[PDB]
PDB file of C-alpha atoms in Angstrom:
ATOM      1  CA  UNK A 415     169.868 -32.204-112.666  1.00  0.00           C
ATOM      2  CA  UNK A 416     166.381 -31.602-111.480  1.00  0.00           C
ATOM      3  CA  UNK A 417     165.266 -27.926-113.137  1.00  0.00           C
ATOM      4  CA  UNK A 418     164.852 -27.437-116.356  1.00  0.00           C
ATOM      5  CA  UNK A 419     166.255 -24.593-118.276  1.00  0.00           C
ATOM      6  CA  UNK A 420     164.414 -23.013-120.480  1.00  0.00           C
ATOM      7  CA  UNK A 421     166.328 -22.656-124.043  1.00  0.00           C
ATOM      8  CA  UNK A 422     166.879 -18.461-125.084  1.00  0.00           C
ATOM      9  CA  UNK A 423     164.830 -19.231-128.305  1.00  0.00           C
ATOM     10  CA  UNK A 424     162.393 -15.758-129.460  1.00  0.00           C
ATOM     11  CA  UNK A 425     159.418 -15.815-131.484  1.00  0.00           C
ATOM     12  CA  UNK A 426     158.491 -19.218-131.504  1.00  0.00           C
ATOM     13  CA  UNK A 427     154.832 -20.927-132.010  1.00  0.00           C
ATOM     14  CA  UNK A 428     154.204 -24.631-131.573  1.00  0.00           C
ATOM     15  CA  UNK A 429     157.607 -26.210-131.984  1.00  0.00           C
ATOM     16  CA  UNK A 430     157.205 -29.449-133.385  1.00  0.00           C
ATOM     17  CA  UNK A 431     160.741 -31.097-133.452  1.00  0.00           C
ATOM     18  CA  UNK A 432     163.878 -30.828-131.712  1.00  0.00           C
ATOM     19  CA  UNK A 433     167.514 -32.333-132.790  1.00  0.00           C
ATOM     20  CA  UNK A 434     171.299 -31.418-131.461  1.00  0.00           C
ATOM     21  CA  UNK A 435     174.644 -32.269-133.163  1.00  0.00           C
ATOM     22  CA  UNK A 436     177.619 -33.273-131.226  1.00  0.00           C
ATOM     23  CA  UNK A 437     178.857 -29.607-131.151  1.00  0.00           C
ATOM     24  CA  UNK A 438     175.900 -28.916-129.147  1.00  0.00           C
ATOM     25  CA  UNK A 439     174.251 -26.898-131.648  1.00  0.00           C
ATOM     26  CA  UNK A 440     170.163 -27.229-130.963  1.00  0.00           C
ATOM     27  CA  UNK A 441     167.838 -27.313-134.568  1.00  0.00           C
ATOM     28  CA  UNK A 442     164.053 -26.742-133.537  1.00  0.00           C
ATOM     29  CA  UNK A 443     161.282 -27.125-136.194  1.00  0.00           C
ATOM     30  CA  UNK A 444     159.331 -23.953-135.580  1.00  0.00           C
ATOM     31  CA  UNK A 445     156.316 -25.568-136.792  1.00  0.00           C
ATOM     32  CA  UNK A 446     153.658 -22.455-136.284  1.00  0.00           C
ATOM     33  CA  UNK A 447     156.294 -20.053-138.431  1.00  0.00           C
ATOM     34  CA  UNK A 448     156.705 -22.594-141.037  1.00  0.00           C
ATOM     35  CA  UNK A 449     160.900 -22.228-140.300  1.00  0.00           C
ATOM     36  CA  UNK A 450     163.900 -23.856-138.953  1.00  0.00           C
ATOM     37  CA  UNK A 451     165.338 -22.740-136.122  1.00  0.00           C
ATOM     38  CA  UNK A 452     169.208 -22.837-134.852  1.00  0.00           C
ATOM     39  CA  UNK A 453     170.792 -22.395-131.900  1.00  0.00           C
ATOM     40  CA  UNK A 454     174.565 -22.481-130.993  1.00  0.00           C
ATOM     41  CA  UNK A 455     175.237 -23.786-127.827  1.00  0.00           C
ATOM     42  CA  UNK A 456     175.515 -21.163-125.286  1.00  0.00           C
ATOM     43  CA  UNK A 457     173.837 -18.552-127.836  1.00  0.00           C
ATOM     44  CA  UNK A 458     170.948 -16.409-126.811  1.00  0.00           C
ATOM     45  CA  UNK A 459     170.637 -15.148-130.805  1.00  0.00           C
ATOM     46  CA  UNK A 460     169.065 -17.930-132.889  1.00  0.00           C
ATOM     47  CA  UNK A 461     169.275 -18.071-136.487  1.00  0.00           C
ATOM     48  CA  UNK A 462     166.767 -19.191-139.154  1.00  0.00           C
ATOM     49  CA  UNK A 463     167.897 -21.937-141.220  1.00  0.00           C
ATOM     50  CA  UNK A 464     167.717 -20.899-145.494  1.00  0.00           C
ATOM     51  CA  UNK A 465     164.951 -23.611-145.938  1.00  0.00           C
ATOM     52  CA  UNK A 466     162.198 -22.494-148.823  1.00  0.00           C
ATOM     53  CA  UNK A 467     157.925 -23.097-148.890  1.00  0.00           C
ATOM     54  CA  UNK A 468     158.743 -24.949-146.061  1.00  0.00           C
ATOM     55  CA  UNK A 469     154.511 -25.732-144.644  1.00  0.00           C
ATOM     56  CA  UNK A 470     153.658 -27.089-140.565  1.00  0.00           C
ATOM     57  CA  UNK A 471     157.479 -28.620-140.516  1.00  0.00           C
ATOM     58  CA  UNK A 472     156.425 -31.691-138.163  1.00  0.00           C
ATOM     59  CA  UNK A 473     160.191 -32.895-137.637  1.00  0.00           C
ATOM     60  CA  UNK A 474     164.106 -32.416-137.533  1.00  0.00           C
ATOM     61  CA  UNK A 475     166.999 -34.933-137.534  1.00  0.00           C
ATOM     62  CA  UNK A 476     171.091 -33.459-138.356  1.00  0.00           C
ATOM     63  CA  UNK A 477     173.502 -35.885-139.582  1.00  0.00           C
ATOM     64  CA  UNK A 478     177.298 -35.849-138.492  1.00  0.00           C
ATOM     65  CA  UNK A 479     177.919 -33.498-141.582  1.00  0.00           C
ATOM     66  CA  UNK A 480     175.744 -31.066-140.353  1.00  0.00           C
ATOM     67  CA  UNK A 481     172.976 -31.422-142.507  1.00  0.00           C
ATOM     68  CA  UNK A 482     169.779 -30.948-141.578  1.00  0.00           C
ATOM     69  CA  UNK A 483     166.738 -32.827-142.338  1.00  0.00           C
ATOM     70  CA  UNK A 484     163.201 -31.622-141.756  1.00  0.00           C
ATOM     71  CA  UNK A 485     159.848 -33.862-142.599  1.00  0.00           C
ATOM     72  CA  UNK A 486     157.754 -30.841-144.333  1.00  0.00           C
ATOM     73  CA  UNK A 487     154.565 -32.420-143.262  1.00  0.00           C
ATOM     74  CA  UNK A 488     152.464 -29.820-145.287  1.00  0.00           C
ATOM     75  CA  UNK A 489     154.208 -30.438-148.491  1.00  0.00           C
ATOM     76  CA  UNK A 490     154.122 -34.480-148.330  1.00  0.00           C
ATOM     77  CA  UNK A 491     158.107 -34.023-148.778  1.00  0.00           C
ATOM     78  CA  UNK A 492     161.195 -34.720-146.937  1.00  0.00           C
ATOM     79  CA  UNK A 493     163.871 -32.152-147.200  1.00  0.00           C
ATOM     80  CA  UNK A 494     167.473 -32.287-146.261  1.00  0.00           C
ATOM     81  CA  UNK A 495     169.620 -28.774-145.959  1.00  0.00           C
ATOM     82  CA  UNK A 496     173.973 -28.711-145.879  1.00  0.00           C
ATOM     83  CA  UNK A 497     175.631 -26.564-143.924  1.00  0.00           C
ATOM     84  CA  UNK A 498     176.217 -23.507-145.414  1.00  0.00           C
ATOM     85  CA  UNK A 499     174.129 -23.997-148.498  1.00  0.00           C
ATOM     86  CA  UNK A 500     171.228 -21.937-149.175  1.00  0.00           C
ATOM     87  CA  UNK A 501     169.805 -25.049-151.316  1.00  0.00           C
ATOM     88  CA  UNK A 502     167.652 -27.591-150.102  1.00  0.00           C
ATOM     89  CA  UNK A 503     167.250 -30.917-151.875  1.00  0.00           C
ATOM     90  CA  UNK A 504     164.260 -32.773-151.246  1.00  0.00           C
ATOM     91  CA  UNK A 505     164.624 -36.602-151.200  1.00  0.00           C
ATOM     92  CA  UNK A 506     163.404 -39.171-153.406  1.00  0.00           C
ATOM     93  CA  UNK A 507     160.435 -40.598-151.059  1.00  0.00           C
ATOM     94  CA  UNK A 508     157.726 -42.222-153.577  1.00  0.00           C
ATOM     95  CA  UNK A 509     154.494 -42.693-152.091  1.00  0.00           C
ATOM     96  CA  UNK A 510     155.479 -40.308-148.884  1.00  0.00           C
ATOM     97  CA  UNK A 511     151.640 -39.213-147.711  1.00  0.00           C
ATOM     98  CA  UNK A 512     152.787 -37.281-144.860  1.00  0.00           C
ATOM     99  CA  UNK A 513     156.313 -37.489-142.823  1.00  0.00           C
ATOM    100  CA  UNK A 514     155.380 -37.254-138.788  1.00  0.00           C
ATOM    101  CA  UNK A 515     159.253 -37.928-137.724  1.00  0.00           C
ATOM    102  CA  UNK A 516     162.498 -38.343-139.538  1.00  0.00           C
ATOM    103  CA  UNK A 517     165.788 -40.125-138.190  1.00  0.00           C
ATOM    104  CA  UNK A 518     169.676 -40.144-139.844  1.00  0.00           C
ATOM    105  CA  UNK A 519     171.683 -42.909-138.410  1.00  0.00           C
ATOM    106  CA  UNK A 520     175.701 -42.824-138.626  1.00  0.00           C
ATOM    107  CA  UNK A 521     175.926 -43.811-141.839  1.00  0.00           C
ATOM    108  CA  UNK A 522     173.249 -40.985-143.494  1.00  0.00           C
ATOM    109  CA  UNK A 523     170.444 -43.911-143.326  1.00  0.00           C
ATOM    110  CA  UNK A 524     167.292 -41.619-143.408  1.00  0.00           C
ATOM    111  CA  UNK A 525     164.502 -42.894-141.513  1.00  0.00           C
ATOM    112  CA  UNK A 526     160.351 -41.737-141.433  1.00  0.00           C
ATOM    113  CA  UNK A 527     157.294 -42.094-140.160  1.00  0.00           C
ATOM    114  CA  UNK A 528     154.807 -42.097-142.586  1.00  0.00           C
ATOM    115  CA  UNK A 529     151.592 -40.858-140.497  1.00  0.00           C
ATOM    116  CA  UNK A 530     148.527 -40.868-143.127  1.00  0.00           C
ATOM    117  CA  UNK A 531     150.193 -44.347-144.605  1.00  0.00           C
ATOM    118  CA  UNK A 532     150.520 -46.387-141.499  1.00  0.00           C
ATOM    119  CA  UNK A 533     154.283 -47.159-142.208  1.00  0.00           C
ATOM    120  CA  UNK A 534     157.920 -46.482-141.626  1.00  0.00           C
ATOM    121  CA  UNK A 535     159.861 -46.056-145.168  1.00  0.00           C
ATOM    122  CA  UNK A 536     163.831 -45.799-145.236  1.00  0.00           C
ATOM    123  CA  UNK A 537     166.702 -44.493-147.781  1.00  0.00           C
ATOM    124  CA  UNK A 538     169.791 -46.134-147.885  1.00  0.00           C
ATOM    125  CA  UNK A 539     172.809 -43.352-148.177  1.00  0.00           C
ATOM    126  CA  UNK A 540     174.035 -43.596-151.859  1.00  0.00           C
ATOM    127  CA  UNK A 541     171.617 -45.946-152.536  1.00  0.00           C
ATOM    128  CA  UNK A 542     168.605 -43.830-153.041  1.00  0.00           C
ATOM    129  CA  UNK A 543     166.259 -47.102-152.826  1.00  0.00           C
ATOM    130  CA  UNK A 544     163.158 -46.837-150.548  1.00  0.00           C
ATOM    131  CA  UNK A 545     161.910 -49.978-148.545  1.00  0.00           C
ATOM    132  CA  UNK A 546     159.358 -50.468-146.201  1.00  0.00           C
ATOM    133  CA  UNK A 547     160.367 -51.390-142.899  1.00  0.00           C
ATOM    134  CA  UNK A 548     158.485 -54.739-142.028  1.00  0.00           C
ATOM    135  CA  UNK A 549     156.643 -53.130-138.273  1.00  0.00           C
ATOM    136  CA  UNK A 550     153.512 -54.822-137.670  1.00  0.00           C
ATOM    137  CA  UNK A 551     150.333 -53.558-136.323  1.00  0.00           C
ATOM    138  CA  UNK A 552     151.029 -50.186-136.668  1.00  0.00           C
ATOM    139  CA  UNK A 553     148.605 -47.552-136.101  1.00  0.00           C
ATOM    140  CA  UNK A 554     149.394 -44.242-137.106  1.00  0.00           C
ATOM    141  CA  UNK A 555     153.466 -43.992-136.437  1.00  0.00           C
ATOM    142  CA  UNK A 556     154.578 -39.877-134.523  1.00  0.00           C
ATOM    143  CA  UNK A 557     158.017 -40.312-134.401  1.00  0.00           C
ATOM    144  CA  UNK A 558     161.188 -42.804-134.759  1.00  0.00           C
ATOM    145  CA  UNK A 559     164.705 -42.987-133.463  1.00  0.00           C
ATOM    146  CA  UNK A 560     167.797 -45.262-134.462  1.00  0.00           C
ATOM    147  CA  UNK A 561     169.982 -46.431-132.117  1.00  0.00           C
ATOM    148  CA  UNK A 562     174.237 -47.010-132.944  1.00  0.00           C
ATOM    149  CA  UNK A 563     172.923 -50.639-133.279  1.00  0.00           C
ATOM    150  CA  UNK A 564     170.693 -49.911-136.173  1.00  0.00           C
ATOM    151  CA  UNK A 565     167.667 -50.741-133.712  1.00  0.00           C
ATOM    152  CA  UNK A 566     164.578 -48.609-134.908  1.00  0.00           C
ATOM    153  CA  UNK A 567     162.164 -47.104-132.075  1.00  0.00           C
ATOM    154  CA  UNK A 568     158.386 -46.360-133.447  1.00  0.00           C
ATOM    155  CA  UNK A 569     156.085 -44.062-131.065  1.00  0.00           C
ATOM    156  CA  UNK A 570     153.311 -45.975-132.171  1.00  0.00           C
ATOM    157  CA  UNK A 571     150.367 -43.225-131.195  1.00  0.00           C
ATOM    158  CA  UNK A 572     147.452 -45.046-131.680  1.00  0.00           C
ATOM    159  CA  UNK A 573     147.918 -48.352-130.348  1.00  0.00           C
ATOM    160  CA  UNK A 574     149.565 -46.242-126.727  1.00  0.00           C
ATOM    161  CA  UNK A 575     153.222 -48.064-127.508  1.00  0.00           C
ATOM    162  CA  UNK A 576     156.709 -47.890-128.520  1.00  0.00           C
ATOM    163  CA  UNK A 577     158.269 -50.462-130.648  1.00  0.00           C
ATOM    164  CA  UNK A 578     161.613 -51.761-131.899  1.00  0.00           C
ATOM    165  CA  UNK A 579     162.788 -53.558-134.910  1.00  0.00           C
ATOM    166  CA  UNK A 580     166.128 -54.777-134.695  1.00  0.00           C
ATOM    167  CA  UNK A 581     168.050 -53.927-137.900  1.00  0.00           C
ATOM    168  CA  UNK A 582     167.568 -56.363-140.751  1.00  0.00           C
ATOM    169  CA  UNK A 583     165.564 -58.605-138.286  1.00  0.00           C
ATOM    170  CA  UNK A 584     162.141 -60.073-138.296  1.00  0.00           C
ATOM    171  CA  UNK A 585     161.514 -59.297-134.753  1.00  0.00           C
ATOM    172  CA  UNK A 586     159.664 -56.465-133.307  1.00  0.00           C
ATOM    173  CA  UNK A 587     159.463 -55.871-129.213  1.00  0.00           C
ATOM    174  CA  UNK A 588     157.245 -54.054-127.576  1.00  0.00           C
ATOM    175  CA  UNK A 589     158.674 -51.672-124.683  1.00  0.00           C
ATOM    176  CA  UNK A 590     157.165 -52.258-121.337  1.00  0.00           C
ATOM    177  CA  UNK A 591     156.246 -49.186-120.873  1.00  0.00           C
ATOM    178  CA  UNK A 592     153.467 -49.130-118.391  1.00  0.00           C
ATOM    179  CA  UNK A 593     151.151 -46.118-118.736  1.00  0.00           C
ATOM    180  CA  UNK A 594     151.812 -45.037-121.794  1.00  0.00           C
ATOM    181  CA  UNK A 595     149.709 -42.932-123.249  1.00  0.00           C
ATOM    182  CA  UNK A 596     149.138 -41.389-127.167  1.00  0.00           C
ATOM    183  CA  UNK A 597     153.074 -40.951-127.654  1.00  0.00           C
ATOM    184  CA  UNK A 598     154.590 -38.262-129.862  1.00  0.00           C
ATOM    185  CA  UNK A 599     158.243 -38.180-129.924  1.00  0.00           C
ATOM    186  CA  UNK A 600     161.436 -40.791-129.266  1.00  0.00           C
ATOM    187  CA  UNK A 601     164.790 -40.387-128.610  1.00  0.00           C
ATOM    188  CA  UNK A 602     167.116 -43.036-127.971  1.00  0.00           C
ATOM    189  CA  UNK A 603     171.079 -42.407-126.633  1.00  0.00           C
ATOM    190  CA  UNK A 604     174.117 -44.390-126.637  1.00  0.00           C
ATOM    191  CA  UNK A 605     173.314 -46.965-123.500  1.00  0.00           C
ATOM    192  CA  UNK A 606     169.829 -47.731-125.152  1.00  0.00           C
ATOM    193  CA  UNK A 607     167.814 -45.589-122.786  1.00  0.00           C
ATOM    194  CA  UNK A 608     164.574 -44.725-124.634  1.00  0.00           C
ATOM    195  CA  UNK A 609     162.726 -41.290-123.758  1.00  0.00           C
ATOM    196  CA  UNK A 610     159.247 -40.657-124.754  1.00  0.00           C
ATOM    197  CA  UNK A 611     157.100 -37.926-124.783  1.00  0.00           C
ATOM    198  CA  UNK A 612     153.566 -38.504-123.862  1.00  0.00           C
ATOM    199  CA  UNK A 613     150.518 -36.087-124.527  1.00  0.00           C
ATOM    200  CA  UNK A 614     147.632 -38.317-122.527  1.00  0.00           C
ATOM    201  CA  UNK A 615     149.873 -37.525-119.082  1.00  0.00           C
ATOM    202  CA  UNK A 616     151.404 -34.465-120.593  1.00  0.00           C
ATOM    203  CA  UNK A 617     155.263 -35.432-119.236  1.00  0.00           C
ATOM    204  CA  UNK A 618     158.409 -37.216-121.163  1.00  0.00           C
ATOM    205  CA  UNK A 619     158.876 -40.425-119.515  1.00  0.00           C
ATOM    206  CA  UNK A 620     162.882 -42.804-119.687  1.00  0.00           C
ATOM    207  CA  UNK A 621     163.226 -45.960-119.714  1.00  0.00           C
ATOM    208  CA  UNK A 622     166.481 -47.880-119.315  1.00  0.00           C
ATOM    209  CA  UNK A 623     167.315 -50.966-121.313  1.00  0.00           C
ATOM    210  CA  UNK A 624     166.549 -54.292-120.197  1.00  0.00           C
ATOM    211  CA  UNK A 625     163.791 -52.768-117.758  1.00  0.00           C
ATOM    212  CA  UNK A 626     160.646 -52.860-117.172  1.00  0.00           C
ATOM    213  CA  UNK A 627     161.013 -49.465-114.445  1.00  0.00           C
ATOM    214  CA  UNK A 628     160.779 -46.184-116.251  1.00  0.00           C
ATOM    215  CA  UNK A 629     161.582 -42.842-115.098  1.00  0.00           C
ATOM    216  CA  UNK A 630     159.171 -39.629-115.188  1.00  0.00           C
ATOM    217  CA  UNK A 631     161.582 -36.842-116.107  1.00  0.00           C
ATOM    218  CA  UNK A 632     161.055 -34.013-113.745  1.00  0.00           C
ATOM    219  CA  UNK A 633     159.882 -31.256-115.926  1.00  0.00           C
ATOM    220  CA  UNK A 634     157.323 -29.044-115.177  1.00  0.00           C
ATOM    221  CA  UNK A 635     154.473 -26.461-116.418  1.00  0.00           C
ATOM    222  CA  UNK A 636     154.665 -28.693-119.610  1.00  0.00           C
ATOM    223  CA  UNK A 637     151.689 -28.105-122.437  1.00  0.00           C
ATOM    224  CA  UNK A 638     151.599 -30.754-125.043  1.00  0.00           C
ATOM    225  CA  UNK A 639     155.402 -31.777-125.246  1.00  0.00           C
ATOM    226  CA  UNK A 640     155.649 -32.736-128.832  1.00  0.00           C
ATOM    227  CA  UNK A 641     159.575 -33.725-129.546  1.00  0.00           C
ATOM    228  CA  UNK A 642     162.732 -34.819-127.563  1.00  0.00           C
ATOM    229  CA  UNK A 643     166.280 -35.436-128.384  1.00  0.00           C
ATOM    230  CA  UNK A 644     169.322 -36.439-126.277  1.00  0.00           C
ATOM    231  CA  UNK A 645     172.778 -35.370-126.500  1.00  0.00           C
ATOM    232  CA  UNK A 646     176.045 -37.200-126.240  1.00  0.00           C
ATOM    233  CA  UNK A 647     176.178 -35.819-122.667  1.00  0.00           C
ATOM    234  CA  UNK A 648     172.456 -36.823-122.158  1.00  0.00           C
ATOM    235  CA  UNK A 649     170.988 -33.425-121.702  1.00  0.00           C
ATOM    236  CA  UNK A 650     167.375 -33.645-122.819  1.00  0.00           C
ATOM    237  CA  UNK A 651     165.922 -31.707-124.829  1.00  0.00           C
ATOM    238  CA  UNK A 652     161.881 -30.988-125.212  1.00  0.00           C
ATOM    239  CA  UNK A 653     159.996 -29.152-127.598  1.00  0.00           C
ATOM    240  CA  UNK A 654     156.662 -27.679-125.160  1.00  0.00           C
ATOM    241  CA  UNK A 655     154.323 -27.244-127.654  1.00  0.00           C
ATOM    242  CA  UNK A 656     151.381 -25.711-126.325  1.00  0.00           C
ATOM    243  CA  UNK A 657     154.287 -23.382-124.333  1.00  0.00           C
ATOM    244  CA  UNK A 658     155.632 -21.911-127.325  1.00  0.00           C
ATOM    245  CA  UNK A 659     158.766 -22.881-126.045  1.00  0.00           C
ATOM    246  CA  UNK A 660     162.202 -25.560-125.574  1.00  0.00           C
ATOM    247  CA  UNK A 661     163.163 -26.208-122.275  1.00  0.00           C
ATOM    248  CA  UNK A 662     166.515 -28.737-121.575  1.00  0.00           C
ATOM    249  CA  UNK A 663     167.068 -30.637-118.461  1.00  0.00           C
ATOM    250  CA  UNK A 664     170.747 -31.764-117.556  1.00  0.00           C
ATOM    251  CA  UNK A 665     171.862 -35.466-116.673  1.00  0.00           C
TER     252      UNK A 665
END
């Protein structure tokens, strides 16, 4: 598709995050009303997840159970949320400054950026053990995605870049990306097509695997987008910031 649609969200105020679960269900991190956001697929009535004290949410990630994790950037915390519970449980990050992005792979890996610490930190389902994921170079880290691989994807912001760190590998590749600028959010989908959002240009740029020729999405009217996500049927899905708004754009 080429026109966006604008998503039948009310009351929103600089929406930081943006994540969908294969039932099409769209989870937006209302960032300026300190809430979680929900949206059904074909739903023009939101609802507003039962999160608590939640502070400037910065991010939003849903595993294949449903639950729903949110990086609580004001509270230097990472909470996660089941569905139907009315309980969140906040996960055992030590040393978390504060969470800028948060990823869940397939098998409830949990995955984040930590901004003010330079670093990407993990937790093993189960397993509860933190470690450090060996990136190099960063420079203040905005967002991550995992691929089915177990490939990581860093927005590294200040260094204009997006890198990858294969899993359990010592090898981290720089996208050629050309014209990047200051990116904010990552999404990756299941033929290893990367999409970026990108405040210095103000548009959410693709790029394919294996090249080196990206695409700029065709959105417009864009202010500051500030998250993306992709869904199984690669809809994409942008969180307009400065718009007050979440507007989709069809494959």
């Amino acid at each position: 598709s080429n026109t966006q649609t604008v998503l039948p969200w009310t009351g929103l105020n600089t929406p930081s995050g943006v994540a969908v679960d294969s039932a099409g269900t769209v989870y937006v991190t209302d960032h300026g009303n300190n809430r979680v956001v929900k949206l059904a697929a074909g739903s023009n009535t939101q609802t507003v997840l039962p999160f608590t004290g939640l502070n400037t949410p910065s991010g939003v990630a849903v595993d294949s159970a449903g639950t729903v994790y949110v990086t609580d950037h004001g509270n230097n915390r990472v909470v996660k949320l089941a569905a139907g519970s009315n309980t969140q449980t906040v996960l055992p990050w030590t040393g978390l400054n504060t969470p800028s992005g948060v990823a869940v792979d397939s098998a409830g890996t949990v995955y984040v950026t930590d901004h003010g610490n330079n670093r990407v930190v993990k937790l093993a389902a189960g397993s509860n053990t933190q470690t450090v994921l060996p990136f190099t170079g960063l420079n203040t880290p905005s967002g991550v995605a995992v691929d089915s691989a177990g490939t990581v994807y860093v927005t590294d912001h200040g260094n204009n870049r997006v890198v990858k760190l294969a899993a359990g590998s010592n090898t981290q590749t720089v996208l050629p990306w050309t014209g990047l600028n200051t990116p904010s959010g990552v999404a990756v989908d299941s033929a290893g097509t990367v999409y970026v959002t990108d405040h210095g240009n103000n548009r959410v740029v693709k790029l394919a695997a294996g090249s080196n020729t990206q695409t700029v999405l065709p959105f417009t009217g864009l202010n500051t987008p500030s998250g993306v996500a992709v869904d199984s049927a690669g809809t994409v899905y942008v969180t307009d910031h400065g718009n007050n708004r979440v507007v989709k754009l069809a494959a």
